[PDB]
Amino acid sequence: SEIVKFNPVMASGFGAYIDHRDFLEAKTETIKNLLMRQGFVVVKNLDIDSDTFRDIYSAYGTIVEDTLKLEGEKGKIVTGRGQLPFHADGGLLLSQVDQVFLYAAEIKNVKFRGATTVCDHALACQEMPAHLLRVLEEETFEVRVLWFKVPVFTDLGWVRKMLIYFPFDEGQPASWEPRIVGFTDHETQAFFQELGAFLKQPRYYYKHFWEDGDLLIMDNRRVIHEREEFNDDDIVRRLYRGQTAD
Amino acid sequence: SEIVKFNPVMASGFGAYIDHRDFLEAKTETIKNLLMRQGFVVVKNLDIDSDTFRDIYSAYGTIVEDTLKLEGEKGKIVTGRGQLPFHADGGLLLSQVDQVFLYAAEIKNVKFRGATTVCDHALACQEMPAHLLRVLEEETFEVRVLWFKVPVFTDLGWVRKMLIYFPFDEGQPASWEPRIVGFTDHETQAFFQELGAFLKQPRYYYKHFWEDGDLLIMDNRRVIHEREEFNDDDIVRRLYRGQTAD
Amino acid sequence: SEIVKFNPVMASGFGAYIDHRDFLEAKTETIKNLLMRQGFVVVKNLDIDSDTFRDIYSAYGTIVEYRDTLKLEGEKGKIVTGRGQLPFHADGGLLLSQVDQVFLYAAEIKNVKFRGATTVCDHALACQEMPAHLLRVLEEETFEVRVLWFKVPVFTDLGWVRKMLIYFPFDEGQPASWEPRIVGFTDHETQAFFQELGAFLKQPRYYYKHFWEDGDLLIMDNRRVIHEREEFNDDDIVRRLYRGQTAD
Amino acid sequence: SEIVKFNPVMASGFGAYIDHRDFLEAKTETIKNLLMRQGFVVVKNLDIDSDTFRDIYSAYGTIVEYAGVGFGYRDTLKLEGEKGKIVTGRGQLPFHADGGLLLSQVDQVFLYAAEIKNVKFRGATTVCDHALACQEMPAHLLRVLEEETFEVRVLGWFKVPVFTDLGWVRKMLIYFPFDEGQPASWEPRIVGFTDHETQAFFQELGAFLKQPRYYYKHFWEDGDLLIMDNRRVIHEREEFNDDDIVRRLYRGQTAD
Amino acid sequence: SEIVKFNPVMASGFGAYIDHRDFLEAKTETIKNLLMRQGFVVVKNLDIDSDTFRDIYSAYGTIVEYAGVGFGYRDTLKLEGEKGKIVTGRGQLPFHADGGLLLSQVDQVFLYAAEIKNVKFRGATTVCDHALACQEMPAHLLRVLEEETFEVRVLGWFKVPVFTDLGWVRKMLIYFPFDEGQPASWEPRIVGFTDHETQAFFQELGAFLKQPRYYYKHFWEDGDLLIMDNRRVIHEREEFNDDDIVRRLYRGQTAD
Amino acid sequence: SEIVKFNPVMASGFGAYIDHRDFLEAKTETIKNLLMRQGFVVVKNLDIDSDTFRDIYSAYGTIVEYRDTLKLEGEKGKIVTGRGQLPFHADGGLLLSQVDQVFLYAAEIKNVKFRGATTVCDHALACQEMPAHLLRVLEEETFEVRVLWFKVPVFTDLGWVRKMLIYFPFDEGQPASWEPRIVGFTDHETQAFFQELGAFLKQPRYYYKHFWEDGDLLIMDNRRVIHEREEFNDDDIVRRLYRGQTAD
Numbered sequence A, B: 001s002e003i004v005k006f007n008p009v010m011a012s013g014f015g016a017y018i019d020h021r022d023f024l025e026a027k028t029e030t031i032k033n034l035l036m037r038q039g040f041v042v043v044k045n046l047d048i049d050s051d052t053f054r055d056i057y058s059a060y061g062t063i064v065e066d067t068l069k070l071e072g073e074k075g076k077i078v079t080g081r082g083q084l085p086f087h088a089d090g091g092l093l094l095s096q097v098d099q100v101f102l103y104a105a106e107i108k109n110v111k112f113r114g115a116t117t118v119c120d121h122a123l124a125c126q127e128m129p130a131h132l133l134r135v136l137e138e139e140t141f142e143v144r145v146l147w148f149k150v151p152v153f154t155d156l157g158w159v160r161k162m163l164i165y166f167p168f169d170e171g172q173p174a175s176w177e178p179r180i181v182g183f184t185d186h187e188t189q190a191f192f193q194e195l196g197a198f199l200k201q202p203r204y205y206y207k208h209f210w211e212d213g214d215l216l217i218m219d220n221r222r223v224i225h226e227r228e229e230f231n232d233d234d235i236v237r238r239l240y241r242g243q244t245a246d
Numbered sequence C, F: 001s002e003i004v005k006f007n008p009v010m011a012s013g014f015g016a017y018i019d020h021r022d023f024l025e026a027k028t029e030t031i032k033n034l035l036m037r038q039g040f041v042v043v044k045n046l047d048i049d050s051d052t053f054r055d056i057y058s059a060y061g062t063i064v065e066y067r068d069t070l071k072l073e074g075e076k077g078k079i080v081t082g083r084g085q086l087p088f089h090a091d092g093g094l095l096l097s098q099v100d101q102v103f104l105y106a107a108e109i110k111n112v113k114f115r116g117a118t119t120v121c122d123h124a125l126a127c128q129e130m131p132a133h134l135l136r137v138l139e140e141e142t143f144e145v146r147v148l149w150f151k152v153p154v155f156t157d158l159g160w161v162r163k164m165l166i167y168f169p170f171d172e173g174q175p176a177s178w179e180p181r182i183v184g185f186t187d188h189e190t191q192a193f194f195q196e197l198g199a200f201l202k203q204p205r206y207y208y209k210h211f212w213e214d215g216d217l218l219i220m221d222n223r224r225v226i227h228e229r230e231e232f233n234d235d236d237i238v239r240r241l242y243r244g245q246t247a248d
Numbered sequence D, E: 001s002e003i004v005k006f007n008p009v010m011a012s013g014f015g016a017y018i019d020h021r022d023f024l025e026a027k028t029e030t031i032k033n034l035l036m037r038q039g040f041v042v043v044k045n046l047d048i049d050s051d052t053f054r055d056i057y058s059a060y061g062t063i064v065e066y067a068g069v070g071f072g073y074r075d076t077l078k079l080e081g082e083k084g085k086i087v088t089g090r091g092q093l094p095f096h097a098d099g100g101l102l103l104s105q106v107d108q109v110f111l112y113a114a115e116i117k118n119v120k121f122r123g124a125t126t127v128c129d130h131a132l133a134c135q136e137m138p139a140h141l142l143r144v145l146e147e148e149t150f151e152v153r154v155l156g157w158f159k160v161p162v163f164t165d166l167g168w169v170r171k172m173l174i175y176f177p178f179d180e181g182q183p184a185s186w187e188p189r190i191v192g193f194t195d196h197e198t199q200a201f202f203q204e205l206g207a208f209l210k211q212p213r214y215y216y217k218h219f220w221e222d223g224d225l226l227i228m229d230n231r232r233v234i235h236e237r238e239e240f241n242d243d244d245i246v247r248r249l250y251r252g253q254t255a256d
């Protein structure tokens, strides 16, 4: 049972900053293990190509289809230039995703836009006002792709894996749209605005501003994530994405 | 994915008090799941016999040998009347134990002795002074039965499962004896006294005083536990113990 | 002196969730005592009519009238009994009537899941922790109210608590039953004070939102907390509450 | 409602240090009210005599006489460290609240320092925030306090109700065992607990109650006034068994 | 070493409220020392004139003159809400620290209230505990402050070093953008950041810095004295654009 | 003005773990600055001799002498250079010598894993949070020391910190190099004050224990922290430290 050296990202002890030499010396299982309790791994100054990226992520499990190039294409949604709001990977196409990997191939002209952000949902659900948690636990959430049930919590024991799909902000091209059964439009919009503000408080929320060579690894059962908008044509933001499951 | 109603035991949110009707209505997997994150389940006023006890615990996995009667026998250690200090189940006989169940068959003349106590090791290891954690992570711990290595941490991802065997207090009949390699007798005694006091602080530590019909369930990977002495001949303290693993 | 079993509502330990059987088996004095230090009591799954509701509340003291039980049913073209917001207040400072305990029971709730909340604020904890420039206004300045001008004292030292009597301004678009002013403050200043104080008191440490379901009973100790009703201006909503008020 | 200026004594916001001039200008009702939520009031540099002390304390309610009936004469108890005594003696008075129930209840306790010499780290009067302590204690300690019968005898056994629910607080009455070597006027027991259990309970509870979050130690100086709301706190006197110590306090008690 | 009595302003223990008599009896060095760790000193009910104000502040170091050189005459700046001006005007002064570097550095800033009328909730001078805020902020905000080049122009671009490490504190110099509608004497930019990014950064940082844990608002009354250790805090003036408001402060600056 | 990368040692954010390469690449002024607000710096995995150690420390100011580098090697029948406890203190108040920075380097450590620690106390945080009856003695009472009687002031207001000079009593059985007393206090009272204050300062919030390994460098800002050496009275122990002291 090996140990990797790390520093916490959040003040709560969640998250893991890992030095690139330490990351590469470490076995796949050590990082895979650490991700379950830390939710996310941040590695800076890693110099790899797309093939080496594939070799790193494919050791963590079976690949969920292989590498998605998120390069900010004008006219697209997921591989486009706008917001991708709070979600977990996999549950809209109904494939299990355990680990999500994001590598920065090229970042130019962007310093305070285009963040990938990460939320500690288990701590947030534990600390949130009773009225927010009640809706999440007892109500039926449905999603349509731009109507089917997406279960909010799936009890894996060690965590209640969260699957949720937030509404896109006004003015951002929407890839999905949520609804809550028995809730009106006014109510669902209010709920998400309020839950969203709770989840974005700095105790649970990490914003990653990308740089060349960054690697962001997320345990898809332990956190939910978001992309912030980067709708300025001068921005080059090319990320590579890999996805594994067991 | 079902939900059981519960209240936290500790101020930190750890532990689960579950009402006996709620416990019995709940599926085995719901309780098994909750134990992974809550460490322990406390149920009061349950009226079962030893056969029903067996039927409840055996649904959680394969039985580790079947039911041990801990009835306070004068002349014995584990089934005796004195202290059993901080330990996890299974690692001295080298059998995997995932869940430990304790049911109070009969408690008479005891109100502030004979506690089974439970420690939140993952929170404690996270918050403990660096000098205590360093010994636990880097040094070799050995145990002899009254010399072999017992690994302190076994990384399961969701938790670092702890296996440790504290020294018995002076005057208590010892079933095991620990040692730390490269540490003298003075050092090892000092280490355990200091770590023991850290672990027994109320943020991480729950003491259960037994009553007829209590059921204590422990996830053996998430917590370590102890029995406090009950060396008064007037005390009747009969517990039934079951152990499961997957 | 007996004990009811309860769970706290707030992370601070304020509030009391009480099981319906535990509530009904408890003596009146036991709940009435609990309310002084816990502020509010939430009971779910009760199935009582208006007479039984009256029997429960009237045992806590002398009935304060408006005419005992007020039916808040969301009647259109009305205020208190209307469909809009009732901003932060304590009961009984507009009429000169002492109100110690306020009782709210849900007789019928339909088509509403995230609107029409009755909310509750732990004002003693909030006043103890608020920035000094907000507290200073509350403690030393004169607050007046017009019923839609008279002095309403913010604090009344009862010892165990400084009872709060305050009447917040209604949001724009919500029909006002009252209107506050602070003497020596301009209209800009009063609006800014209340907006900032409102946001402070709405922080989750001090603030509980109760979304109503059939059979819920909310009891508030009126000296210990202040409260608010959020708007429910959708015509599909049925929200019928029974209201009782007591004092000694 | 009138307001007095004060600073909190505890980090939790409990307690009230009040400047002497602010205390003297204050109405009796202002301090009496504050005491309910702050538990205790500490005033330094008050130069009063026993008559003036009496006029200050007697305004707060009916005088509870110290203890074939009473006529209002036994008002001010002089705790002057008299050898051969307990309450007015020189040893420890462990955790308790004053008075009893019904007519012998005490709401406010007043302690003024007439003369203190040769003592800098013994003889403290200490004060415990019991309501916050009971809210935060491990449940195994709280359960004993809430569900068991505590009995006391004078140095035959009588029940002392731990909690009396006044609503605003659960008024506490408890009598901790005197430490070994200290002369005892009382002895506690818990029904159904053995001597070992009771000794262990009180030791652990004591340690919990003495944590700085809930506990204030008052080291006496001439002119100090310590007022306690007896329903809100419990208190203790630490030992002063050194013959060179002069420690004379005046004690006053009131109730409504 | 001499000690002054004070109460903390913030819940974190930062800030110092000092009674006027205690301040007046205090040696200059006692307050100057306290200011380094408490950031700011608040004194109420001081009835002094501008000459006496000058004698108080000039004892703390060398007078920094307000701003073809200086001869010690431009000492006390009268901020009297003069229309058509910015610093001595009636609008917002957003987050900044006084002075600059080297010879134009300021260690202590003094603000005394000569006359305040018709204002109860506008025109505050506000104060931010930047060292605690920088220690607790999300790392994405701290990284910008630590690694990017901040430039400012007067209303051509010049670099303002965010942190100057004095050891005991990282002395902060920053100039936040004036809010829309408020007359600006300065404009910031961040090198390599766009206008959108810079606007978004300052908005988020501003909100973080204005949280009550780090932020104190001072609403002025006649006789108030606000002293700031300029290396330890940053400050702001909120707008007072109402013609009925009289708000006249005297400003003094010193350095070692 | 440059930046060294560091991690805090304490949960409060006090202390600085600095990687050996980062330490050696940093300017002296950068570490010296960091020490004022962080109290202490811990560097592991250095491999330097005594001359290099001297070069590193002497750049921080004027060398304070005892004779520059003190070899603390555990010589028997000695005190400071001995094998026993050195209780809580700051350097340089027994001789009248200003000491700003103290440097400790591990040249050789054998057979010791849980003894002989150099411990460090965050006294400014501790004094800000201590019970008022402990602080009162420290602030208003006269403390005297006998070197094995003269006044040593507890606090010296430097502005940024109140520098602490205090000399705790040695535990029974440990050879005393000094002896404290408080004027106006009896022997019972002084012993009780220190035992209770010692336990307060040893709480994990304020207290770090450094167990020594070959190549460790511990630097302390002597105005900002106080320190202690715990006993190492086992004859099998090799514990050889180099010690440097600077001031301005």
Ligand SMILES: CC(=O)N1CCC[C@H]1C(=O)O
Residues within 6 Å of the ligand: A078, A084, A087, A088, A089, A090, A091, A092, A093, A097
């Ligand atoms: C890969 C993945 O699972 N994605 C892409 C973004 C949203 C989410 C989805 O299911 O659409």
Ligand SMILES: CC(=O)N1CCC[C@H]1C(=O)O
Residues within 6 Å of the ligand: B078, B084, B087, B088, B089, B090, B091, B092, B093, B097
């Ligand atoms: C069942 C079990 O695993 N036990 C019994 C007590 C100690 C531990 C052991 O391995 O000895």
Ligand SMILES: CC(=O)N1CCC[C@H]1C(=O)O
Residues within 6 Å of the ligand: D087, D096, D097, D098, D099, D100
């Ligand atoms: C005044 C009072 O009630 N006293 C005196 C000391 C303890 C307590 C008692 O013995 O009852």
Ligand SMILES: CC(=O)N1CCC[C@H]1C(=O)O
Residues within 6 Å of the ligand: E087, E096, E097, E098, E099, E100
């Ligand atoms: C005194 C001082 O340095 N001032 C005046 C206002 C802002 C700042 C400046 O403009 O530099």
Ligand SMILES: O=C(O)CCC(=O)C(=O)O
Residues within 6 Å of the ligand: A070, A078, A084, A089, A114, A115, A116, A225, A226, A227, A239, A241
């Ligand atoms: O581009 C990003 O920052 C994240 C995209 C993402 O979340 C996804 O592809 O699932």
Ligand SMILES: O=C(O)CCC(=O)C(=O)O
Residues within 6 Å of the ligand: B070, B078, B084, B089, B114, B115, B116, B225, B226, B227, B239, B241
């Ligand atoms: O008897 C008890 O309280 C616990 C015994 C125990 O821990 C065991 O048998 O493993």
Ligand SMILES: O=C(O)CCC(=O)C(=O)O
Residues within 6 Å of the ligand: C072, C080, C086, C091, C104, C117, C118, C227, C228, C229, C241, C243
């Ligand atoms: O929520 C409600 O409708 C009750 C609000 C209220 O305060 C009242 O009617 O006086």
Ligand SMILES: O=C(O)CCC(=O)C(=O)O
Residues within 6 Å of the ligand: D079, D087, D093, D098, D111, D124, D125, D235, D236, D237, D249, D251
């Ligand atoms: O002497 C004291 O310190 C207080 C004595 C006391 O508590 C009492 O008489 O009840």
Ligand SMILES: O=C(O)CCC(=O)C(=O)O
Residues within 6 Å of the ligand: E079, E087, E093, E098, E111, E124, E125, E235, E236, E237, E249, E251
């Ligand atoms: O007028 C104020 O409130 C302070 C003005 C100020 O900060 C300045 O002149 O630097």
Ligand SMILES: O=C(O)CCC(=O)C(=O)O
Residues within 6 Å of the ligand: F072, F080, F086, F091, F104, F117, F118, F227, F228, F229, F241, F243
């Ligand atoms: O830990 C050590 O040996 C150094 C202790 C010390 O303070 C000294 O030698 O002055």
Ligand SMILES: [Fe+3]
Residues within 6 Å of the ligand: A087, A088, A089, A225
């Ligand atoms: Fe995604």
Ligand SMILES: [Fe+3]
Residues within 6 Å of the ligand: B087, B088, B089, B225
């Ligand atoms: Fe066991």
Ligand SMILES: [Fe+3]
Residues within 6 Å of the ligand: C089, C090, C091, C227
């Ligand atoms: Fe109301």
Ligand SMILES: [Fe+3]
Residues within 6 Å of the ligand: D096, D097, D098, D235
């Ligand atoms: Fe007493």
Ligand SMILES: [Fe+3]
Residues within 6 Å of the ligand: E096, E097, E098, E235
């Ligand atoms: Fe300024």
Ligand SMILES: [Fe+3]
Residues within 6 Å of the ligand: F089, F090, F091, F227
């Ligand atoms: Fe030393």
